[PDB]
């Protein structure tokens, strides 16, 4: 109503509070909030004034509320609020305002920082992190829950990534947050840690030093897959680093935890579990043995033969990377073969894409080199593993890869057939 606008611009205190309340009410409906209409009335800048220092606290809370919902619309709608210079004021309210007020301010900031990597960075560059970390020294769960969510948006982003010198500062707080009883809070704290982990060795070392990984592992066995998903994503990001950084996670008992995740009813979880395992079998000889002793190979082989493609794909890597450490420990290869990975491996060539064919041929090749080195020692007439591959129908399929358009593949194929099947 136009009457509302008139009021909002009145010099009369009381009439202004009445208008901000009415305006905030229609942006809080249960249905489609008339955001554009409100913006069109040209009142946004007027609501931004009510968040200033001298303004009555009620008028500040109300105004911020309406403004937070206007900022929950499209990027176009969020820009109207950001272009009105509301951000710097939301930040001062985190310091001066009451708890109800802070609640509103951190919420508004959540929507702005969630619009784009630009706004995410803008909020960070307005130095919002200082006061935000202070919100966590309170006891009220609701406020801490919104601040945790907002913190999540600030850390999210890997295209232009957030300023590491700023976001890295939230680690200590996060470290505590992952022991919360509140599921919503708990969930968002994990996603935040996973965002800070998708970075360089420097970032991985920070998470490691604030002693997060051990807890992160205990969280893999939570009963809500809402906690399991972000926790697994961070754990997996860690084993991306060097051997030493990866040992910290093996030592935290992550392997026994992964054995369970392979049975997860959730498909994307089985996948990432294999992904993680594969970055650990990409490490040294000892780490490969650790995986073998944890008893992960058998279930891996099962998924290798019956999972969805996007999951088999990962199982393949895990098993293939393991075969590497076969040069050093010939038994690893023997174990792998004894567990029956040959047949499922050969069959994958038939439906795999070029990159997975290379990984499969490298594995089959390593498996073949060892079985050959044994023909020597044990003085065998034939290459045991070679005969195994012919059975599974592997030989025919390897032979077909000679007509693959990719040089790396057909060249690899001829060499295998020549060297081991003539």
């Amino acid at each position: 109503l136009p009457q509302m606008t008139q009021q909002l611009n009145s010099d009369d205190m009381q009439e202004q509070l009445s208008a901000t309340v009415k305006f905030r009410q229609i942006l809080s409906r249960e249905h489609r909030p008339p955001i554009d209409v409100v913006i069109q009335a040209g009142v946004v800048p007027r609501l931004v004034e009510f968040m200033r220092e001298n303004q009555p606290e009620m008028l500040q809370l109300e105004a911020a509320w309406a403004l937070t919902n206007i900022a929950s619309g499209t990027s176009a709608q969020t820009k109207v609020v950001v272009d009105a210079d509301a951000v710097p004021l939301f930040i001062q309210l985190l310091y001066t305002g009451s708890v109800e007020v802070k609640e509103q301010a951190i919420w508004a900031l959540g929507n702005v920082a969630g619009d784009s990597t630009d706004y995410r960075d803008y909020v960070l560059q307005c130095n919002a992190m200082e006061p935000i970390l202070g919100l966590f020294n309170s006891n009220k769960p609701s406020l801490i829950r919104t601040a945790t969510w907002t913190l999540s948006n600030l850390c999210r982003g890997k295209k232009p990534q957030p300023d590491w010198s700023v976001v890295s500062q939230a680690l200590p707080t996060l470290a505590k947050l992952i022991y919360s009883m509140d599921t919503e809070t708990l969930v968002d704290a994990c996603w935040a840690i996973s965002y800070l982990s998708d970075g360089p060795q420097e970032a991985i070392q920070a998470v490691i030093d604030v002693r997060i990984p051990k807890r992160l592992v205990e969280l893999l066995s939570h009963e809500s897959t809402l906690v399991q998903t972000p926790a697994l994503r961070a754990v997996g990001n860690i084993v991306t680093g060097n051997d030493l950084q990866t040992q910290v996670v093996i030592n935290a008992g992550v392997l026994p935890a992964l054995r369970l995740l392979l049975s997860s009813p959730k498909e994307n979880i089985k996948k990432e579990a294999c992904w993680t395992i594969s970055n650990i079998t990409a490490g040294n000889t000892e780490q490969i043995q650790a995986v073998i002793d944890a008893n992960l190979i058998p279930p891996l082989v099962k998924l290798l033969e019956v999972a969805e493609y996007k999951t088999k794909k990962e199982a393949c890597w895990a098993i293939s990377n393991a075969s590497s450490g076969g040069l050093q420990r010939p038994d690893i290869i023997r174990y792998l073969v004894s567990q029956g990975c040959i047949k499922p491996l050969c069959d994958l060539l038939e439906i795999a894409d070029n990159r997975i064919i290379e990984v499969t041929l490298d594995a089959l090749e390593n498996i073949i080199k060892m079985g050959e080195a044994d023909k020597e020692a044990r003085g065998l007439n034939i290459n045991e593993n070679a005969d195994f591959i012919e059975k599974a129908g592997g030989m025919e399929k390897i032979f077909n890869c000679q007509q693959n358009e990719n040089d790396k593949i057909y060249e690899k194929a001829y060499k295998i057939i020549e060297t081991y099947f003539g």
């Binding site: 409906r29 929950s72 509103q104 969630g114 619009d115 969510w149």
Partner: peptide, 6 residues
């Protein structure tokens, strides 16, 4: 993501 206060 974004959230609306209801």
């Amino acid at each position: 993501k974004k959230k609306r206060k209801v």
